[model samples]
Target: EEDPIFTQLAQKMAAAAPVDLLAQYMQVEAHDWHNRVRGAILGLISAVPKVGAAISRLIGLFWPANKVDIWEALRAEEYIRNIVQQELFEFEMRLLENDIQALETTVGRYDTAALTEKGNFLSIWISQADALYIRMRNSTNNIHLLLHMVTVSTLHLAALHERLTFGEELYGTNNSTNWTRDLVDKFETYTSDLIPNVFKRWKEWRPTQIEISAWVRRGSCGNLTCRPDVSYATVEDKISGALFSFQATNRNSTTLFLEVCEDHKTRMVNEAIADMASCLSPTFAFHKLLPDDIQTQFSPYDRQQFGQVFRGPYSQDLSHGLWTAFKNFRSRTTRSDQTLRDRILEVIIRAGHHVDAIQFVYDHSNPNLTTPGTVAGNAAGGTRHQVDVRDRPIQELRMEFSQDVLASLQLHFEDGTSTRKFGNELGWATRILTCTAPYGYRFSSWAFREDPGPYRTTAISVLRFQFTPELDMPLPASY
Candidate 1:
């Protein structure tokens, strides 16, 4: 306690129990019996209606002043049987005024071997059904476990409530039978069934490790001596096409993944998410897990973090946003030229009113190698603007942009020949995004964004381009 390294440790330790106990108290106070229990209560009400009502009506007439609700009278008779049970079913109601008055009268947790002078019992089984509410009290610090627990437990409660209602209805509230014994037996089934059910559900949520990398066989990778690593990401296929992938696709089709020696794990995860972008959905993120530290810091108490107490719906949304940005990021940047050494065959610009995006179709300088092309944004509605530079690369680009958008540009080839201006020449801001090493290197690729648009479908809001390293000298080819 005196050590500076752990100052106030004892006080904080002391604070832990009370704070947690209060958390349990508040959690209990906020139970959603309706959201979790109502539908199951349907038709459980007024069952054995014609018969039970007729008998209760007879008992009411004879009882002159001792008028008791049927369920109450059933409590009386079931008491005669060592008794029972719901004026309103237990799961359909909230904490009664009695239970809430503790800081102030407490209800619900009563015990009676027999009936009292008040001679009324709402739900003796419910007093025991405190098992459900009590079971819900602070199971763990992990929200994943919390999610697992609450959903599984509510499901248990939903089914249990339904069963109890079935039984309560089957055994009428006639104040003169063994309904208590039946309810007692029903609750026994609930408790006995709980442990194994929770156990089975608990096994489903174990954290899965994810894998990311390059393929070995198109089927799979690496030497016979290396052990398969499973820490960074998880794979769905190891036997088939080595259908390897991060966990986002783990719950979907079996797919293959890659294994690299050493690369940025975040970058790898980002790339795989883009590749799997087509698989994304509103609820698909369950297949994708959040970063460990991020998932660890998640709190059931922070509504903004998850949009609610549980993690699924909100985290799904959160991961989808990542998917969006990742997809967008890919759409913008993948076309940037690498050191592949291919020469641009032509500059294809789609400009109608404004430039949409650009693509560079290329062929290898050696005549033996070729490229599919480099592209970004969408041509969408623009008019096709092609500038053939044949062999020389582009040296400088002079464009007109305004309102933070692109209007057009004239492509200038290395030999100094420039193409006719392609956009609406009446522009405001003018600038030159010039090029260097034009004779020895190829300009990479362009990336565009569709934003702040009042007059366009997919025009460029911002334009960015890159320059590749000087191309390697091509050796003479022999056939």
Candidate 2:
């Protein structure tokens, strides 16, 4: 009984007689076969003149070579073609290497630049956008083709190696002997069945089937050479890993081979996350000039956006107020029909004899304001005090003045609430009072006059308030 693998090798050996075509050609002086055949015929024709030369031409046409020479050379050329097969495979692989290197250079070129150099990387790179697409396509195709050629060719040659090795070891000549009908029968079955299956398995095992994601750019965009812009920076976060991984023990060279990550697997993935450009040219201290204690606020993950400290768009700087700490205001206007629309929810007044500072929290966030006529003033000091009539709209407000200075104040609500007159009621010559007809919110901006505070006093001078023009509430039936 013979092992089946050897039988196929023996059949292959009968053919090879193991003609080592490459080695044989190297040992001989190389000459063009066609020229040699033509020269030999022409030289023979020269040995005879005209008539004999004519006969020589006929002989040359029919015979061609030392009868045996022509057939042997054709067989040699066939074997020689296989040697050339692997040579150009090596040559083509070099070409693949160069293509990958060139494409890699272009991939490296995409990074941050100042808002100047436009024609080169901006419209230029984007214009030939398909350059990277086609380049990557070719590189990938070559990458796969590179290994497939090596695997498919190497596999066939190794199969051929079986007969050559066995011809030297098990059989003295061609493994043409002991090739019996039973052996032949097994040979037939092995080739027909095991050979195709072996090939199928090898094809399955070593094919260059692979999955990949191609190139795509992502993130913020800006124009190069734009006048209103900043210089920037960018960086990449690269990731690489095997799609599947395993380790195997290495035996000696004959029994085992080292498995390189590149040769054995479909391929490892190479991914990169990146920003093309960001403002490295220092950010404007936009928030510093803004009010509130902080200039820049950072997230937990540390991105600096607008400070979360306050929402604001400050209105007319009343008296160029030196007041600090409470400048936050919103600019959205209120709807006329809203019950609490622009209604003062909180009123805090810092006052001694007169209003010092006044702050309001209105139901409407705040107002985008302007003056059809020019007017306003401010107070700079006193103790803080506040009243909450947030639950109800005010019905009346009263004031007492001593000369030009406010001497006292009081607020009266629609229900059972009235702020007891909060300051000096004595020593006042003039009295002023206002009442909203329908118990509505009417205060707009508060203004106060204080002594020219060069060497000033905390008490206010003149005090007043401007309310929304519509004082009476809209009738419920008005809608």
Candidate 3:
């Protein structure tokens, strides 16, 4: 709506300046009396003064004599301009305050989860939203300023006409008749031509308000191929039978690099942690997994590389539980899980299945070595070990029960609680690897096969044995 005060001012000015009177009296006069020399001579011979006065009267009707005061009209023009400028000042103040209030409200609303629920992408969304609002508000204010100037100029012309047409009403019966013919001509041009154009332009001016949601939604990727930043799940530890919830988000090279650097710093400060875990409990089983040359150089109680422990049955139950947990996790998704599933299976095969531990290792490094202190006939310069009746070729061993092995474990956990318990544990461990790898190290994405889709850049892989509670058991003295 237009301002009430300005509406009243416009009405008063329009009433004072009627278009009919202004148009009839303001036209160019016909002054070609000298060309009518014969008529002029006849008139002068008969009634010269009468003819001359009569011609002058006729011209006066078209170009009327000026009786208005010029100074009075200019004063009225200045007064109206002042009033408009004051209104503009008030408008400017209100506009700025409104902008400040909006910014404050936006800041207050940003920290809540509701903002994210509406499809904001963390801090980046907040930043974009704030900038957009500011830009729109500034544009609106600038347009209003331009419209105000146009309207004020239009009113300035209208006020000048008001004083000239109704001088007595405006300045209280002034006897001043100093109005110039030149101003009268200018006034007529303004009233007839410029005023109509000004009215049309003023009519087009209106307050503008933009709906932020409409503009933002046009560019929004909410329902597009872009997935949510993270997905959450609850899982149980098959080994410890503990349940935990964890969040998983894709991590790119930048994030991975930063994480590794931070992890390295932590490992450096906690050197004792590595020293104790690697040396406190060196089982003969772990030593047997190492190469002969390294085993020969190492003492029985010497620290073993973490990989040696990983390659052996350091904690068979922990690895088994992790495998079971991963199986449960993989079963829940429609996407292919071969890459992560195979890694878990590889660990299970290396550790020797809990049900069939006699499976022959085709790549066994010390095949001719018998159990300590017992030997049979020599084979290949070393004592040959007695083969169990259950032992078979690697291919046969893999083929016979490998298909049913997973099914057998599935049947064994009749309660379903066992599966979920360790499933949660393994899920928790996966989160640690991705988030804060609790042990001295973390799983590198390089170890597993690349994933497809959004996960390709930062694949979500859940493999067993990256870090389990058993691995962290030999705590340092400080812990």
Candidate 4:
């Protein structure tokens, strides 16, 4: 059995045609085949004068006939073929070595500026290799040979790319280059850059067939000046949906740096958090949290954006007052409304209990607040008017209501039917209160329910009593 490729090579050899050695070497002697043939005929005409010259010219018409021994010429032709083949092999090897050396040297100067100089070195070498590959393919006419050479050359080029990227010292280990490690490092660098920056375009960045080529041609070179027209279609990210376009300037080698849009925004937000956490005073006034100086420090557009900590005091106080007022509603019927219960619970889970609780408070607090029918019914039925929280005495009344609110929150856990569910709900509410309460008001969990503790105090007032914890209740139709 014989390889198809070798069979093909043998068929090519059987033709046994010779390259014109005499004509090829004649350039150094100042002549060629055409000049030699013409000179020989003309010399004969000069020696014979006109008549003999006429005969010589007539014979010259078919003078140079090709002749050779059938067997001996063919055998001799094989020897010349082997010699030429070896010479061509040596020639090509030398050419490849020169190219590799040139590539290495050019990339060497780029040690400091390595990754940035993608334009000239890679593009030129790739272009030359492409032309060389095409010639090899045409000359060999063997797909196996062509593909073998292609794979070998491609691997070499890929390894070279990684080695040049980091530099020999780092890419190599113990004076021997670790190609696998170098290649992995190259891949990781590209992967990290694209992950945060252009993560969304995975489909576009990673193609299906996975045939990738890095080459440079005459195109737009973004940063580099010398070869501004040089371009590359090598490794690309989602940001670079197509080819990575850059300009070649005086800086030969450079590294690619990507700053994602989200990352910058995140950085600024984190800085603001740090400033608020470290610089702001604990005794800072609630309303003055985002004061003129601080507001000015942030962008005018961002002035309205507030931090959770800054908003905590107002939100928590309002949440407490509102939720307590619902417990204070004069009519038992209004408190039993299933829709109201559903709405309040939903708001607790979705927007935190305080936001919805405050809105309920506002409606009931003002006489002409145009309250909901059920809320107004409770108001009409009540002997007490809305409490003005601004007054210290009225705020004390509101603070006293915290006990019932805490007791009601405990019912969610006491139900025992979904003890786990109740525990989660209660813990979440407590967590919010813990973070948001005004400086001196500490929330004591035990005092709100049938715990051992009898009472808890805020800087403002004391919650003196606890309500009987109610887990099960019915919904009401009207206020």
Q: What digit string (tens of lDDT, one per residue) describes model 4 on residues 202-279?
A: 112223212233233443446755353332222232211322222332322223111111222222232223222211
- Reference-based TM-score, model 4: 0.14
Off by over 4 Å in 4: 1-88, 94-101, 107-115, 118-120, 140-152, 155-479
lDDT tens readout by residue for model 3, 1-479:
98564565466558865223222112101111111211222222233332123222322321235521221222223112211233443466465555444533433333233422322222233344334333423443333232222222222222222233333433455632532232234333332333323322322331011010100111224555655343333333221233333333442222322232232222222222222222212121222222344446443322222322121101111122222111222211112212221111111111112121111211223555422211111112211223331122111011111211210111011011111111121221211111222222222111111122121222212112122112212212111
Q: Give the TM-score of candidate 3.
A: 0.14
Among all windows of 10 consecutive residues in model 2, the one with the lowest summed lDDT is: 272-281
Candidate 1: C-alpha lDDT? 0.34
User: lDDT score, residue 200, model 3?
Assistant: 28
On a 0 to 100 scale, what is the lDDT of residue 191 in model 1? 31
Residue 461 error for model 3, in Å? 4.0
Q: What is the TM-score of each predicted model, taking all chains together?
A: 0.27, 0.23, 0.14, 0.14
- In terms of lDDT, model 3 sits at 0.25
User: Global lDDT of each model?
Assistant: 0.34, 0.32, 0.25, 0.25
**Cα deviation of 246 in candidate 1 (Å)?**
41
Residue-wise lDDT of candidate 2 within 202-255, one digit each (tens)?
A: 233332333222121233346753232122111111222223222122211211
Q: Point to the candidate with the largest lDDT.
A: 1
Model 1 lDDT-worst window of ten: 308-317
